[PDB]
Design a protein around this ligand. Structure first.
Ligand SMILES: Nc1ncnc2c1ncn2[C@@H]1O[C@H](COP(=O)(O)OP(=O)(O)OP(=O)(O)O)[C@@H](O)[C@H]1O
Ligand SMILES: [Mg+2]
Lengths: 97, 41, 232, 49, 240, 183, 69, 240, 222
């Protein structure tokens, strides 16, 4: 019981669902999709045969945090002695950004 | 309505054996299947 | 501290108590249970299933003996059963102290029903969320009874309670009679409880208790494993 | 494992007797490095994109 | 809406909101710092003067729970005095019942349980205070403990409660308290007080210091006037 | 972790030659843990291949209590299933599994080994179970051929030899053997 | 019936599990097991491949608070 | 799915479920710690992780293991003050049973009584149902080792291997896969499996200074806590 | 106690494996005074496990009918309705293999009334099929046809006849071919019986294959 000017997006959606894994088989074509909240996706789009693999990219670990720090803190014109252990311990639940 | 359904489905049993007339065995099979298969849902 | 002291159950404009209906709908989603009485004693059967293999199946019991000749099973919520069991035992002990005679099943059922009723009218208290099956054998004739969150109680001959109980009642309609034995009663109880079991019926997934003119007792795992044979 | 090996050496899966998948999706909390990984894959592969 | 009007309701995410609001109320105190030395504990509080009318030494924030126990307060004042009274009563009862001075590991637990008793029911409200207990004993050493409105009590080596807690603990970290005796640590407490609370926030302030340890021979009391004056004299050189 | 450790192995090779077999207990892991390490592309490979192949000398060369003669253990059991093929966490494969026991160091020996029947069948069976995987398949087949030709040559039970050979070969799909050999 | 499944694979184990898998993810189980066997540079699929693939594909936690009943 | 105040207090919703208990199960995971309990042939072990974010804190008073009685051991998960109150209650009940009936209280009766106490909160509507977990281990004659679990909903059960915390599901699956093999367990094997389950779930390869291990066995039923040297020895023996 | 029961089961299995029939009958007759000393369930399961194995071993026609009758008598004395109903079904199946006319008919008629009123319906379709078979074997087409019709009509309410489906299809095909109305239907029924009876029970698949080949021969399609 949705509104008008909104069923057109649904029309495009089922057109896309038919284009991939439809009556005609695809060959040598691969697709990649990205989203940071997959709750709202249609149950038909997540079905195996259309999006075969689900990949999770969680928050970094202590070793991952140290790796990212070493990657990004490199080029700066540093001086003196640096200790990454305290920085790794303090930064909890962070991101690369 | 299910009386009409039984009547209209008994002929399918005659068709399934490539016949031209309907006998009461088809009626009994039809009524049994219709009454049993309506138990679910 | 202090409570609320105002009733949480009130009459709807259509003259219905909503909380009782909600409690019954919560009871109806519990584990299945069956009870049968045939001419020599009473049999209570229930289906228990652990989520995984880490659980110990010899730690908690669904069937509890109130005294030497009364047994009781439940269907509904888990924790709400234990307090009722304790209260029933206390009431039985009180009666034994007063009259020096074992309490009849009807008196215990009446007292438990009165407690369950009294627990839905006081201030700031929700009703119980379980239903009970009680079995006994006093003065020659056996007895089977069923309680109700609203406090009502009835006397039955064959009862199925819990999830998918209408089909169980239909099955018991076409098999039960008034002339059988304890063993055939156990067999038909297991057969009707098999209507909702999983792919396999292991001895660890069934609890069976029997009460005859010698006293209520819960069957050992070996006996239940044997009984499961020669069936299905 | 999805987009590189099957597009160059496709007789292995035929030898085993399966068909490689087609698509995949990446999810997680914001700012964990999804679009960056996609950019790296697109910038380090010789194929139409 | 309506999940944060009572202390007896769980939000869908699974946390009580009223205690969070109490912590937010606590977060508007001035500052209180406590550091344990080799042979005792030292407290330091910076107090804001609202106007010249108030007499020197009013609104004391440094109580005396027992003959050997101190106390430092941040948050509302009424709840702080109530907690001080209940702690005094409990310590007196323990001394009278058994016969010897109550250790800290027991008094802190009793007070924490009393505080936690209020965050369960809907007929009361959570407290709005966070406090610190300190003491020294010959057979037990120096003891410091911190308790918050939620009812969580921990031991510490050095703590700061109030508005600029982080800006104070980041300077406590550079200090090395594990060795040096607390005869000169008052200087460090004064210096760490004067390096906070920029003059834009408020015009002026005063300092309050406590003392307990082997130097005072168990008893907790205010620092002498001359020692405090020398402490400010040394701490005033932050302008360099 | 290449030369220097191998220097050690070449130092203690004389000890292996002079002393007895149980000393292998102290030389099996010293390279094996090095195969665990695998930090560099070519060192770990040289050390593992050298150690695994070198166990061949003790086998067969020290025929007593070894595969050539009295293979009660040694290569038949101790160093076949357990050497690396079954498990050593992860065995590097590539040079170490191809150039080692799986290839010439044992296949060549089998050609020039027992000459007798009785344990030649058991040596064949053991060296056939290890290679039932993949991306080797130009060593299992030859041994299968050897077994069938031997069995036909003497006992002449054609039914069984034909049966065994038939299922073995699916060489249209092998994809690595040269055409004039697969034909 | 098309892939290898050499000799020691038991399929009656995986059929016995509950949780109502559809018809388009059993193919996913077989495909994932085949891919996993491909990764190990081997052209024969074993039982561990099915075990790992089945554990990976289904991914249902509990949603079954035990004091229902 | 709601009608009235079923979202705010403990009353039945139209579907037959009450949410105020399901919210405590989510409130359990607020701490962010995981604990495991394993049962052996003649012993029982508990392993838990502990984290100290900063060096200012005193690391000797952040334990999550408590000793109710000289023969019974315990571990908590979830909120802190609630766990402390529950431990106090358990100690009181054990002492009362010992005084009244003349012999040591079995672990299963203690767990049953704790669950009975905790079931009232979900019956009356003027109180919050103490969202924290409970794991108990002990030794008992004629049965050997026993491990029991209790959750805030008023429910308890005996186990052979248990995990509680944020990573409950993965550790439970790992323990199930390990126990399906049906291999006889000894002291070293039980400790090694308990450590490796947590190690593979968290993927940390931790040092001997961030775990707590408690053990009981049939040679001296006294509950004891392992020191750091023994933990280091077990860790170095685990990694070949 | 349990050692005696385990030894009895092992001895029965060994006698069945060896290839002797008199020993099984002797053990069955000897273990009568021992049965009334154990639990009811154990005795019932022991009687079942001996009798079914002895009956399903092979055809030594001299020691089966009387044993089944005495088992029926014991079950009726012990008041075990389901056990005696199953044994009655087995006995009426046995009477057909001994080529008896009326003793295999009135027993089925008696059993049908009791089976109809109770839950069991699969046993009912089995008994109906047996009655159709015995009327067919006595050269009476209409009665066998009526019994087969009743069995088919009452077999549509069962959730699944996992193996009785093949037997029912085979009997329907045989009856249809007996009246030589149309051979395509008989061939289809025989093919369905062969398909649904394949790889489960070897002994009776070859006969279905043979009948299907005969039908295809009769269509002048060699
Ligand atoms: N693993 C990583 N290593 C280095 N930088 C990283 C990493 N993960 C994230 N980043 C940082 O993330 C920044 C941008 O992240 P990106 O665009 O990939 O966001 P995202 O995870 O796709 O989030 P969203 O699209 O939901 O906003 C990059 O500039 C980079 O510095
Ligand atoms: Mg992005």
């Amino acid at each position: 019981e949705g509104t008008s000017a909104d069923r057109e997006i649904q029309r495009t959606l089922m057109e896309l669902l038919n284009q991939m894994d439809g009556f005609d088989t695809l060959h040598r074509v691969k697709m990649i999709m990205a989203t940071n909240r997959p709750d709202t996706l249609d149950p038909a789009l997540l079905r195996p045969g259309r999006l075969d693999r689900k990949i999770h990219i969680d928050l970094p670990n202590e070793q991952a945090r140290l790796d990212i720090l070493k990657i990004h803190a490199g080029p700066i014109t540093k001086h003196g002695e640096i200790d990454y252990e305290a920085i790794v311990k303090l930064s909890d639940g962070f991101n690369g950004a | 309505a299910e009386v009409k359904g039984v009547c209209t489905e008994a002929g399918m049993y005659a068709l399934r054996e490539r016949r031209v007339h309907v006998t009461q065995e088809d009626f009994e099979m039809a009524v049994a299947k219709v009454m049993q298969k309506d138990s679910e849902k | 501290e202090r409570g609320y002291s105002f009733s949480l159950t009130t009459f709807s404009p259509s003259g219905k108590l909503v909380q009782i209906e909600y409690a019954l709908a919560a009871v109806a989603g519990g584990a299945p249970s069956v009870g049968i009485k045939a001419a020599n004693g009473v049999v209570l059967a229930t289906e228990k299933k652990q989520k995984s293999i880490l659980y110990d199946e010899r730690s908690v019991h669904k069937v509890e003996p109130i005294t030497k000749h009364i047994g009781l099973v439940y269907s509904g919520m888990g924790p709400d059963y234990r307090v009722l069991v304790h209260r029933a035992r206390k009431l039985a002990q009180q009666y034994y102290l007063v009259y020096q005679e074992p309490i009849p099943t009807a008196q215990l059922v009446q007292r438990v029903a009165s407690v369950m009723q009294e627990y839905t009218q006081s201030g700031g208290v929700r009703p119980f969320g379980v239903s009970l099956l009680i079995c006994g054998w006093n003065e020659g004739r056996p007895y089977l009874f069923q309680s109700d969150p609203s406090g009502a109680y009835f006397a039955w001959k064959a009862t199925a309670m819990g999830k998918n109980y209408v089909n169980g009642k239909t099955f018991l309609e076409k098999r039960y009679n008034e002339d059988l034995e304890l063993e055939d009663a156990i067999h038909t109880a297991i057969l009707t409880l098999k209507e909702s079991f999983e792919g396999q019926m292991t001895e660890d997934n069934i609890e069976v208790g029997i009460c005859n003119e010698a006293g209520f007792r819960r069957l050992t795992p070996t006996e239940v494993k044997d009984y499961l044979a020669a069936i299905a | 494992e999805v987009i590189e090996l099957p597009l160059t050496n496709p007789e292995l899966f035929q030898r085993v007797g399966i068909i490689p998948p087609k698509g995949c999706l990446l999810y997680g909390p914001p700012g964990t490095g999804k679009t960056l990984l996609a950019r790296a894959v697109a910038s380090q592969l010789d194929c139409n994109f | 809406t309506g999940y944060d009007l009572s202390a007896s309701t769980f939000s869908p995410d699974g946390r009580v909101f009223q205690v969070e609001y109490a912590m937010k109320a606590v977060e508007n105190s001035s500052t209180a710092i406590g550091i344990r030395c080799k042979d005792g504990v030292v407290f330091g509080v910076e107090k804001l003067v609202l106007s010249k009318l108030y007499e020197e030494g009013s609104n004391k924030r440094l109580f005396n729970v027992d003959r050997h126990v101190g106390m430092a307060v941040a948050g509302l004042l009424a709840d702080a005095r109530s907690l001080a009274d209940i702690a005094r009563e409990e310590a007196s009862n323990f001394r009278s019942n058994f016969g010897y001075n109550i250790p800290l590991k027991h008094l802190a637990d009793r007070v924490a349980m009393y505080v936690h008793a209020y965050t369960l029911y809907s007929a009361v409200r959570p407290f709005g205070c966070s406090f610190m207990l300190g003491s020294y004993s010959v057979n037990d050493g120096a003891q410091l403990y911190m308790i918050d409105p939620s009812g969580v009590s921990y031991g510490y080596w050095g703590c700061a409660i109030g508005k600029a807690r982080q800006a104070a603990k980041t300077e406590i970290e550079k200090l090395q308290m594990k060795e040096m005796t607390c005869r000169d640590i008052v200087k460090e407490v004064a210096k760490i007080i004067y390096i906070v609370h920029d003059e834009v926030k408020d015009k002026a302030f005063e300092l309050e210091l406590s003392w307990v340890g082997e130097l005072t021979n168990g008893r907790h009391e205010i620092v002498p006037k001359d020692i405090r004056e020398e402490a400010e004299k040394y701490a005033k050189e932050s302008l360099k | 972790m290449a030369d220097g450790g191998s220097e050690r192995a070449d130092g203690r090779i004389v000890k292996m030659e002079v002393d007895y077999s149980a000393t292998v207990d102290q030389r099996l892991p010293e390279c094996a843990k090095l195969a665990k390490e695998g930090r560099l592309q070519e060192v770990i490979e040289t050390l593992l291949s050298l150690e695994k192949q070198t166990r061949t000398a003790s086998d067969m060369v020290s025929t007593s209590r070894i595969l050539v003669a009295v293979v009660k253990m040694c290569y038949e059991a101790k160093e076949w299933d357990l050497l690396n093929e079954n498990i050593m966490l992860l065995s590097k494969r590539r040079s170490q599994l191809k150039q080692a026991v799986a290839k010439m160091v044992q296949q060549c020996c089998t050609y020039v080994e027992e000459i007798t029947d009785l344990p030649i069948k058991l040596r064949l069976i053991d060296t056939l179970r290890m290679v039932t995987e993949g991306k080797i398949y130009v060593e299992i087949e030859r041994a299968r051929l050897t077994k069938t030709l031997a069995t036909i040559k003497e006992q002449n039970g054609d039914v069984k030899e034909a049966a065994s050979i038939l299922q073995e070969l699916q060489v249209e799909t092998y994809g690595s053997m040269e055409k004039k050999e697969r034909v | 019936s098309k892939m290898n499944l050499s000799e020691e694979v038991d399929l009656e184990d995986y059929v016995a599990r509950p949780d109502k898998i559809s018809g388009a993810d059993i193919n996913s189980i077989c495909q994932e097991s085949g891919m996993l066997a491909v990764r190990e540079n081997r052209y024969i699929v074993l039982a561990k491949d099915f075990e790992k693939a089945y554990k990976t594909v289904i991914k249902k936690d509990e949603q079954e608070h035990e004091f229902y009943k | 799915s709601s009608a009235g105040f079923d979202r705010h207090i403990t009353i039945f919703s139209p579907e037959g479920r009450l949410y105020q208990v399901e919210y405590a199960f989510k409130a359990i995971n607020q701490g962010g710690l995981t604990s495991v309990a394993v049962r052996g042939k003649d012993c029982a072990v508990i392993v838990t992780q502990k984290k100290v974010p900063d060096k200012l804190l005193d690391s000797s008073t952040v334990t999550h293991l408590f000793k109710i009685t000289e023969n019974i051991g315990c571990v908590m998960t979830g909120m802190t003050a609630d766990s402390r109150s529950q431990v106090q209650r358990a100690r009181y009940e054990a002492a009362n049973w010992k005084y009244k009936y003349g012999y040591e209280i079995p672990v299963d009766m203690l767990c049953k009584r704790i669950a009975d106490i905790s079931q009232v909160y979900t019956q009356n509507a003027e109180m919050r149902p103490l969202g924290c977990c409970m794991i108990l281990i002990g030794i008992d004659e004629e049965q050997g080792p026993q491990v029991y679990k209790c959750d805030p909903a008023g429910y308890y059960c005996g186990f052979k291997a248990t995990a509680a915390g944020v990573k409950q599901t993965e550790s439970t699956s790992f323990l199930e896969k390990k126990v399906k093999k049906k291999f006889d367990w000894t002291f070293e094997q039980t400790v090694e499996t308990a450590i490796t389950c947590l190690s593979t779930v968290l993927s940390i390869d931790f040092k001997p200074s961030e775990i707590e291990v408690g053990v009981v066995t049939v040679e001296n039923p006294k509950f004891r806590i392992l020191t750091e040297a023994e933990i280091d020895a077990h860790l170095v023996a685990l990694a070949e | 106690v349990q050692v005696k029961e385990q030894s009895i089961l092992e001895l029965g299995s060994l006698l069945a494996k060896t290839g002797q029939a008199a020993e099984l009958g002797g053990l069955l007759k000897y273990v009568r005074p021992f049965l009334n000393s154990i639990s009811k369930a154990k005795a019932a399961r022991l009687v079942r496990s001996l009798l079914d194995l002895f009956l399903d071993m092979e055809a030594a026609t001299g020691q089966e009918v009387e044993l089944c009758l005495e088992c029926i008598e014991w079950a009726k004395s012990e008041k075990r309705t389901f056990l005696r109903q199953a044994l009655e079904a087995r006995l009426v199946s046995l009477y057909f293999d001994t080529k008896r006319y009326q003793e295999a008919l009135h027993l089925g008629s008696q059993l049908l009334r009791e089976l109809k009123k109770m839950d069991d319906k699969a046993l009912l379709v089995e008994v109906q099929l047996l009655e159709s078979k015995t009327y067919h074997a006595l050269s009476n087409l209409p009665k066998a046809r009526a019994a087969l019709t009743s069995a088919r009509t009452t077999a549509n309410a069962i959730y699944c006849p996992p193996k009785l489906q093949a037997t029912l299809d085979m009997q329907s095909g045989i009856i249809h071919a007996a009246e030589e109305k149309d051979w395509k239907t008989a061939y289809s029924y025989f093919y369905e019986a062969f398909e649904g009876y394949d790889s489960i029970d070897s002994p009776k698949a070859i006969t279905s294959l043979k009948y299907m080949l005969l039908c295809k021969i009769m269509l002048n399609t060699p």
